[PDB]
DNA sequence: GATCTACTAGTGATCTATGACTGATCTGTACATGAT
DNA sequence: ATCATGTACAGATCAGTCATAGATCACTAGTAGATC
């Protein structure tokens, strides 16, 4: 596909933050995205001065979308990303 | 009725598994050469 | 005139080598238990 990849680790550092997000040697995008989403919803509940809510998950989105009633409606995609300083995959 | 062996509690050293620094490798641009 | 080949330079990433926390090992006082 060139666009799509499976993510493996060389080194499980120790207990490692991301161990809970593993489905083998493979980092699970859906687990990570679910915990991310959970945290965001938790904090969003604690916002009392702004009308902000979490939008229902859109299929094919790497984001957690917020609807803000700043009277007018504003949508904010909070996109979970992994940063890699290695050289770009061959497909590029 | 006292002294040597088997076990428990307690302390502290020694050994054993993980993050940070340095050298080695890789990729590409600028330039010199050689071809039409 | 222009385009392919080889060298230096530059920056970045990757692979290989030391300080720190937890586990393990050694020794001693105190017991009980067995012997004289």
Method: X-ray
Phi, psi of A42, deg, nearest 5: -55, -50
> What is the spatial distance, in angstroms and rounded to an integer, between the CA atom of A14 and the C1' atom of C22?
13
Bases in strand B with any atom closer than 7 Å to a protein CB:
18-19, 27
Instruction: Identify which of A72, A69, A70 has the alpha carbon closest to the alpha carbon of residue A55.
Output: A69
Which residues lie closer than 8 Å to A78 by C-beta, 6 or more apart? A40, A63, A64, A65, A66
- Binding-site residue set of A for 2',3'-cGAMP: 60, 77
> What is the spatial distance, in angstroms and rounded to an integer, between the CA atom of A70 and the C1' atom of B21?
50
How many Å separate Cα A48 from the centre of its chain? Answer: 24
- Closest C1' nucleotide to A12's CA: B18
- Closest C1' nucleotide to A15's CA: B18
Which residues lie closer than 8 Å to A21 by C-beta, 6 or more apart? A27, A28, A31, A32, A35
DSSP state of A37: H
CA distances from A9 to A19, A22, A58 (A): 10, 10, 28
Number of residues that this document lists for chain A: 92
């Amino acid at each position: 596909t060139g666009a799509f990849y499976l993510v493996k680790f060389k080194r499980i550092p120790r207990g490692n933050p991301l161990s809970h997000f593993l489905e083998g040697e493979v980092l699970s995008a859906t687990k990570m995205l679910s915990k991310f989403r959970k945290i965001i919803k938790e904090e969003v509940k604690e916002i009392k001065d702004i009308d902000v809510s979490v939008e229902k998950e859109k299929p094919g989105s790497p984001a957690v979308t917020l609807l803000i009633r700043n009277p007018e409606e504003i949508s904010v995609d909070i996109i979970l990303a992994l940063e890699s300083k290695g050289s770009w995959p061959i497909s590029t």
